[PDB]
Amino acid sequence: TYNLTSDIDAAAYLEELKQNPIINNKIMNPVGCESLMTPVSNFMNEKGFDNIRYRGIFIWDKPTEEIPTNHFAVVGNKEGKDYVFDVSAHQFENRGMSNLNGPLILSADEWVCKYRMATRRKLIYYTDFSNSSIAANAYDALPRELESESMAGKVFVTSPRWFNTFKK
Amino acid sequence: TYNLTSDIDAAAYLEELKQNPIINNKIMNPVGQCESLMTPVSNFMNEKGFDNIRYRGIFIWDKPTEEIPTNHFAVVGNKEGKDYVFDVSAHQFENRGMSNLNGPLILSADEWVCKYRMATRRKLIYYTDFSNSSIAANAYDALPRELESESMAGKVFVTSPRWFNTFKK
């Protein structure tokens, strides 16, 4: 399924982003993510996106999982519509989300669809923040109990059946 | 990308539909079947306890000057509060520009939207749901029609590509 929107010229944005070796390094070897928020954000700001936010994401495989998987994307508005630059989405390509096979630059709706349709069993939710280090703190990679998590401010991309069973 | 939801046991619904030889035939040969499929699928869903059954008429437009848009039909029903779309002839588009549509679909409403949205980069896709199947077939017929004179009232947009936003003047 497609990775780059034609709502904006994502193809050309991606070309430009790859000329930043901090970014390109990850686009080629997407493992290990936060450090992208800044250069991606800066890029977007130069291209005229505004209301730039940092999206912290958790991916939960099971209720009893000890540390959820985190992930980050940057969101920005261009002519009234939200877009998500998630240039390291494809670190999930070989982790059960093979539909995430390259960097994403998508409308907000397309991005949600991309993740939703990549998996049936994983619980995926996010929060958008004004500050990237607040995002990294709230969606950190430390042990966390799903039963003790506040769903306040969490936006669900999926809700697997186990998770509704789990909530009770 | 998955074709059957795990929100309900779409795998078992699919298999039961495929147990009916008339429906099996149309799923194996889906081109042009979606209209005739509405009633039998609807009857199945009704029997399986879905309510508020509607008939979804769909246009897919390639460009503004296209003489006749491509049409399609699916059936919507509610099961324990949530809408599910049975679209068992979606794979008619597989070898026609929408290769991500590679089998029959029984999905949540939102899943069904994502499937279509992400299957094309630049087709305009929109639909309307009707209580009556023959009204749906009429509304979304395959007769000559100009995009420019379509009312957008009551259309629900799966896509709204850049070119269409422009076309809107």
Residue of A nearest to B117 (CA): A110
| Among A100, A83, A123, residue whose Cα is nearest residue A30 | A100
Tally the residues of chain B.
169
Lookup: tokens for B58: 């769909």
Name the CATH superfamily, with its identifier, for domain B1-169: Secreted effector protein ssei. (3.10.670.10)
Question: Taking CB atoms and an 8 Å cutoff, what residues of chain B touch A7?
Answer: 161-162
Coil, helix or strand at residue A75:
strand
Q: Which residues contact A10 (CB under 8 A, 6 or more apart)?
A: A4, A105, A106
Give yes or no for B20 touching A (CB within 8 A): no
Give yes or no for A165 touching B (CB within 8 A): no
Where in chain A are the domains? Answer: 1-168
10 Å Cβ neighbour count for A133? 12
Pairwise CA distance, residues B37 & A104, whole Å: 37
- Pairing label, strands A69-78, B51-61: unpaired
Pairwise CA distance, residues B156 & B169, whole Å: 19
Pairwise CA distance, residues A159 & B153, whole Å: 32
Residue of A nearest to B157 (CA): A109
Question: Taking CB atoms and an 8 Å cutoff, what residues of chain B touch A118?
Answer: 1
Q: Which experimental approach was used here? A: X-ray
- Per DSSP, B17 falls in state H
Secondary-structure class of domain A1-168 per CATH: alpha beta
**Residue B129 is a catalytic residue:** no
Distance from CA of B154 to the nearest CA of A (A): 20
Interface contact flag, A7 B162, Cβ < 8 Å = yes
User: Which residues of A are tagged catalytic?
Assistant: 33, 71, 86
Residue labelled with tokens 């999206």: A55
Tally the residues of chain A.
168
10 Å Cβ neighbour count for B55? 25
Pairwise CA distance, residues A159 & A16, whole Å: 35
Beta bridge partners, A55, equal: A73, A128
